[PDB]
């Protein structure tokens, strides 16, 4: 098991103290490109950002 667990580095609780600890810690613990700013920017007809910003935004998933 490669999950990252909680670890009590120091001391031992009794089972009741462990139950309190864990209950407390547990109790504490779609694209919509419409009007994206990149559409609002004004580009030169030859601006490379039409590739590297605009398409790289609209196409990106």
């Amino acid at each position: 098991d490669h999950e990252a667990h909680i670890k009590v580095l120091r001391g031992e609780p009794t089972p009741e103290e462990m139950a309190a600890l864990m209950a407390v810690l547990a109790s504490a613990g779609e694209r919509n490109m419409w009007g994206h700013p990149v559409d609002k920017l004004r580009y030169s007809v030859f601006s490379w950002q039409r590739v590297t910003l605009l398409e790289r935004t609209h196409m990106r998933r």
Partner: peptide
């Protein structure tokens, strides 16, 4: 459900089955 959370305490594995959703 139950959330069986493994804890290590000084190296002892100790599953605590908490109530699931909370």
């Amino acid at each position: 459900p139950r959330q069986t959370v493994v804890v290590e305490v000084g190296g002892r594995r100790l599953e605590v089955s908490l109530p699931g959703d909370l």
